Design a protein around this ligand. Sequence first.
Ligand code: NI
Ligand code: NI
Ligand code: NI
Ligand code: NI
Ligand code: NI
Ligand code: NI
Lengths: 100, 100, 566, 566, 566, 101
Amino acid sequence: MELTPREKDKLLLFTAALVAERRLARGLKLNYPESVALISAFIMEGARDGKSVASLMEEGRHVLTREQVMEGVPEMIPDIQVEATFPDGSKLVTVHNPII
Amino acid sequence: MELTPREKDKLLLFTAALVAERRLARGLKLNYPESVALISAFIMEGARDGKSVASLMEEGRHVLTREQVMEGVPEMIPDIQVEATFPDGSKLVTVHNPII
Amino acid sequence: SNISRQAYADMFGPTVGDKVRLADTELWIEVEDDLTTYGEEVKFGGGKVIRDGMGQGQMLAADCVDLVLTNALIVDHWGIVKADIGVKDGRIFAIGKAGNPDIQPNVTIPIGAATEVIAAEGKIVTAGGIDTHIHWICPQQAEEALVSGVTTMVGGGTGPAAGTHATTCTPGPWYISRMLQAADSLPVNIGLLGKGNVSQPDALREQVAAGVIGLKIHEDWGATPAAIDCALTVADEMDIQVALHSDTLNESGFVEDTLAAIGGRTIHTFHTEGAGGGHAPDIITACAHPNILPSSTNPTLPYTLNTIDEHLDMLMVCHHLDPDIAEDVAFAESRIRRETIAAEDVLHDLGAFSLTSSDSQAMGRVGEVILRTWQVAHRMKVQRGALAEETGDNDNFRVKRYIAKYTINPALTHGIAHEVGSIEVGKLADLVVWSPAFFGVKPATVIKGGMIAIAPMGDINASIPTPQPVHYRPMFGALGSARHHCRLTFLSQAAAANGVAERLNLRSAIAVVKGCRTVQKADMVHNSLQPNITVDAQTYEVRVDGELITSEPADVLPMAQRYFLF
Amino acid sequence: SNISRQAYADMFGPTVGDKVRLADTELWIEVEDDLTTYGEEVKFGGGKVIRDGMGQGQMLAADCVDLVLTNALIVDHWGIVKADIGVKDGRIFAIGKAGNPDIQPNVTIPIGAATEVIAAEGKIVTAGGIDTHIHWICPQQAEEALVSGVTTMVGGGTGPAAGTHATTCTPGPWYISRMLQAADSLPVNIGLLGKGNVSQPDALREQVAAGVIGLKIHEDWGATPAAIDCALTVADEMDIQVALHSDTLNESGFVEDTLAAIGGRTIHTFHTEGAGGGHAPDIITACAHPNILPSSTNPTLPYTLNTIDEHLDMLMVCHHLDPDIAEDVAFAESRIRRETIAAEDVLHDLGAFSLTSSDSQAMGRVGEVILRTWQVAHRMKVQRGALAEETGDNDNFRVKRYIAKYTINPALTHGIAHEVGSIEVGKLADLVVWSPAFFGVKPATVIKGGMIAIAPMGDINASIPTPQPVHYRPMFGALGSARHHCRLTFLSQAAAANGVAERLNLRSAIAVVKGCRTVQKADMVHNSLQPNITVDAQTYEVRVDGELITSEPADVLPMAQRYFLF
Amino acid sequence: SNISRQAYADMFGPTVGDKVRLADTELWIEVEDDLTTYGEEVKFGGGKVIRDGMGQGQMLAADCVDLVLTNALIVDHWGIVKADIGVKDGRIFAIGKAGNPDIQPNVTIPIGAATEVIAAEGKIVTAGGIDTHIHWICPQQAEEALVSGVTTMVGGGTGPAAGTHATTCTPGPWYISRMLQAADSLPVNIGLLGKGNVSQPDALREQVAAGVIGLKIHEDWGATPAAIDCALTVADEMDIQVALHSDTLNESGFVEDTLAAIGGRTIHTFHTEGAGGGHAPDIITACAHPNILPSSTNPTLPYTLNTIDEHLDMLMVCHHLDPDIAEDVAFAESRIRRETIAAEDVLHDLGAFSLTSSDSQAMGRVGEVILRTWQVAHRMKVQRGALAEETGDNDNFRVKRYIAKYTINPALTHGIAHEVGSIEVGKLADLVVWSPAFFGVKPATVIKGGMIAIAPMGDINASIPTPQPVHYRPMFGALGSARHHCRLTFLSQAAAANGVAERLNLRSAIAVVKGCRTVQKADMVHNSLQPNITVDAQTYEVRVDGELITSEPADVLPMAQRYFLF
Amino acid sequence: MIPGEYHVKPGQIALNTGRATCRVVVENHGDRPIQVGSHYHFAEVNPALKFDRQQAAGYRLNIPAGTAVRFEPGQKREVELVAFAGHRAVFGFRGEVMGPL
Ligand code: NI
Ligand code: NI
Ligand code: NI
Ligand code: NI
Ligand code: NI
Ligand code: NI
């Protein structure tokens, strides 16, 4: 596979998001690192599907609501940023105020 | 668990294969590292079940077809090799031309 | 005896007239020459050529090379040729024909008992890349850059501090001394940039005498005509290069006032297109002057569909800018312009922009200098066809013109072309071996100073090195004392003179920069065009000699989704 | 010109009278003073203040600082103040107002070409923590402690060997010499503890002359009155500290017999509450004596719902105890008492217990010294309200009293307060930068000796340092020769004298301990209470002056599930 | 006082006459002797024996050991005995009874204030393994081998280069010098092999004087009678060993011609069974000669169901062979023979094959030398019953015969048995501690030179060292300067003489090889059989004295799926 | 589109042009197979190969560099040889020349 350090690093992010998706499914309110992981992982998969940067800056605001996360968590996350390989190469997606 | 460096390393391979299995399930055509991971992970599980080296050299040619992978990918993978602990200890499985 | 060209290509790699596609791009190179004698090629293995009395001779170590790369297809600014490469004492010894002269004809690279072999048949060999816009935000950037094929990193910083986040500056003697000490632990050649922004020259000469090989003038520290002039006067006295990120705000003047402060002296302009920084909206006109060596940083290479969108946001986090502070947000659409971003690709294709660089973790991707340079060449071929210089049905000239942008031109600009930058006799053996399907994307072997420093490696406990998972792991060239021997820390001539290496107890080999003041645009290999270029102040359109220069954004690029897991 | 307090807080961080909540606790600090001149604050970035001729002056390196932390909110034992912090030659140079005196008023910290900037507006800056109960079970504890905000680790051990599993002792000259050599590779300041248990003083002086800065007397090696007396006589002669884990079994005497052996000499009592070890059930009475410096280890801080349950089991694995061997199991309920565990929190709140420490991987969590200290302060505020010393509507006094327990008090107890322990002029620049929402939990930057040594870092290949995944990675201050320059190995005065550093070829900077014998309880900053304390031999209730001291276990704590992935 | 044998076994580990099963195999060892005095065993912990004045005495450091391993069950070539082990100055000091002679009887290993303790009750202690067939393909092989229990690695290579992929050769002075420098960073003892294939002796002596302790003659570099003779003449003059991988192709002669070139001089034959390389199909007959020291490499150990299948493919990738080039594919079924692969297991059981080794990442698994050696012993017990030498109801003799194959016999073959290889007084303290259920599979502690270098370690932040995840992590013996003190780089006598260590600035301790030329098959401990062995040229059946030697392939082995995650 | 694909120009290459060649009939008289490499000094091959040694002197097999000819026990065959070039000094093999010729 010839994995580069950056590909190995994103594997760490995907795994932390698997921890969060399971907890969300048991119906827990997510904490800080769990929330940041879950939303980041969703944007990396949207770039793999070929969605545009602009579509993802928007859809990323709809993954989790304030009722699915612990108190103070939406305030601890003013934005989330993640880069992924889009069909047109690496691009940065910034989601502002993702948890409303 | 007393994990050795080699056991930790194979955990990296299993996780990359979880990334590929999810994408395959959403119906994407897989890329190079995704394909190499998915087939490797399948052979490690066949050795855990106790299949023989000869059975796996064959079944490994049937995990993905040319229609489930991107263009040029079957040509970038002339063979895949992976070692796993069979009931009779570590053995190397080589799958030639796995994507047809 | 005869053998068909196809079986020959299979056994020894391509020869004269054969063509190879680079990765999944539309670029094809054609082999221009082959230095072998057919039938006398050296090949290593059981029952093969390289054996005692056969392709291996009786000479003592001093009379043979330490390492031979057999049957390599070299791609460099000077040619695309098939040859054996000999390395001796960490340097390139010869490009030619290897073997044992006791029984073989025309042997120029002798193989003995002391010779190790890397089989290069079927692979492409290039020089290692040289990135001259590194922000030393974290030490992990060195391994990411090495894995991508970059073996020399020039930049400034002290870690993840606001100053370094924004600018390539290692400020002052104490930080310069600590970073020269930390550089011995990194597997790449390094030279450091000091803080060029000051109007007292002595505060500059103190940094140069401490060890920096260059000064960065950045607008976040005040890119005023007084500071620019002072840094250039110091640079002319000490034989060091000046890198410039100009006054975007036009606070102290417009582009022509900064061009006037420079006054015809040699300067390297960073991110010359301007999205990464510089007089809005026309810093790009700087590529018309003979004393300007212009580079692009990589997020704008090539222009694609998501380019503009991603940019507005990344501006912010880098520079220390408030999105609510409307002055800190009015200058983004003055900074991010689709007009100058589309013209920049064409300017690279014409040779008016001479270097590519990252701007690492400060609006630039440290592991994407080489890959994006090839993606721009591919997009230019697909849109503008063959260059005028091109001869034959191949893109050899365009490949030489682009490989020069991250190899020889940055080494010439920074005064280190005597050590590194091209595959030429006497230079440091920093070489990268690529299989063609992964050319520019993931290398097969990276050689630092004659030792393999990092390579893709499968299961450590396996019966062979190839079983999964295969990922890049550091090799013997990256360890301890062997690493000190196979890397260079570059110093200014003054520091070298003052014994900075002995005083900081530096352990790596040291090299000195020289020739920074005399280099000019005409010296940029295959990239010496000085166009008559204008930017419309209202619409920002770029014209060269009254012709509008523009291009179309890609929706999809090669060297992208086919190769990467995320 | 006027600006509202709210926009001012947003741009430069809080000022006098503003309040900040620490993480998700109920503790609020109020800014007590601000050293700036409003309108003259320094801020770094494009078009900002720190630029040539503006907030940046013309001075040579010797006349300016290497690093300025701008607009920091300092929290230390001496005050909660807003100020700029200047660092020069690896030390704290000034707390005051930074800038360029050529155009700004009241500048005490001059910024020049040689100055790097860390923007601290909106952040809290503290000294680095000092943990004095480390079992050197593995080298990985150093990075876990550094990430948590602890920059100095004092302890003993040789790795995962039964002796070290149980006790903080590096036994003998050979092991002391090997561990001083291994310490150069770790990014924290270190001092080592020898094996104090012996009744022949020469076997002690040999360990001190080898390099230990202290002796641990532990009951697993025999904490008898003869061994205690011998270690204290050696300590008084060589100016080193004695740490004590007393005879839990009451085999050689009861607590008053050990107190009698000590005979009024200075001693640091580890895990003074007693669950981690000591005369059952009353070692806690030791905090009444003026020559005792008492610490708690952290699994009992604060008292919560699962505290007791978890404890019975962890006793076992640490000490080398058989759960079937009823003598090795009858002493657990004599060791684990809800009565002394609930009183210990209150004793911290009153200042009768002076230090907090881990007891790492030997009934204690190396990355939880700071977080648990704040969780105890929060639980005390919620249960007992304001302290008597408190003035104003804020918890400033309680914050100073608790921050002292892992900063200045351990440095005073161990004889190293001349180097580290507080943000004061001349001390080593070991500083930790926290964003308020993560105060005490996950820092933003950890500075060792004036260089960033570890910090949270996003994707190495990204266009900025902030994209996911963000995790702690070692920086330039943690690498090779730069690390040797930015850390200290502490030695005893005798070792330093005998040239131990030159003989073992130690590479880091060396500091010497002094003042271990004269420190007493009255010298513990904000924690000098000597209560008239008793423990009922049958019921184990703790009383101070006949009043029962107790507290309630928490069901939920702050600095817990909101922050951590597992 | 009396105690039952069962509670005694529980507290202090087994004693005379008790039996232990090794891992999940059918092999049982029986304790042959116990050096303790019942009632006087030393045990460490709260209220236990090792305390001041009790099991711990008053002696100064020079009169006591640095480390005692208490109540260990030793398994070595000389006995299976229960004893305390004392280590002093990095070496084995005594095997005997530890304690304080002031109050205990028959104390031979004195415990003082300077003594650290590793509790070995219930564990098995062996010497560290010695692997003599390492291809230095990547530095990561050192940690994989250390984790498995191998503390000394002899081999050759320069990294992942074609030459090293195929052969254990570090060619020439420049590469030998770089690899000796890189060896200081690895936590195992190392000695290097040069390129033995040349017919000019001076090109050989230059490699030996550069530092190699041996020469590999490999057929990929031409294993001709001229090259073999030249390497052996150099070896006899310089006291270094020759390792041979013979001419599989029978190009220059058959096995008897290579045996004739050797001419009765000492030589180590690698992969003597022949699948890993050598005259097809009869290199195996080499074990009949008194001057041949024969090893097996491990993929053929023991013979199992998937053995043959996996082999055809791995041949290919190692050697640089074309599966389409029918000459590069006709020799596989001449190389891979079920007949010689089944006889090899029996030959190990009889003592005719003397060493086991990996052939790492070049048809061999670097972390499986020890585990496969025990799996062969188990399969031989199950198939052939008790050896003739065996006395008692236990397999002690077979265990001594097999443990000798990766400990003392490789140290004798390579001239380093004066430093390492067995648990004997004066040798380097490289020891491995195993719990019986994981014997041969996953160790509990690996001691290099008297310091723990790697061990299984749980959560760094936990209250004890045992909570999950537990995985192998490097300890203090593996760090920086402590590692240099606890490892050896072996050099030839000439290099040592020429001051190679001072010239390359080697930091580790140096040891010199000696006695390589005088060792012969009769000197192989418990493995000195010279059988009258023949191979049928057509059918390849192996016979010893006209009896057919064969065995059955296992379908399932112990030390396999019960222990490993993948 | 195959990443990294070659476009080999058709035809053939002539090996070892301009050097003397000779053919010789070789018979493997041993009981074990013998395989010979492209640059091995043919005159010093395993003695079980019967042929005219004096003709093969200073020659090697005329086959693509790095390939081999295999001789099964009993096998007889005619091979083509091409002379050594360079200094024409023969060192090693069976130790029969060890100098020029
Ligand atoms: Ni810039
Ligand atoms: Ni930049
Ligand atoms: Ni204790
Ligand atoms: Ni403790
Ligand atoms: Ni071999
Ligand atoms: Ni080998």
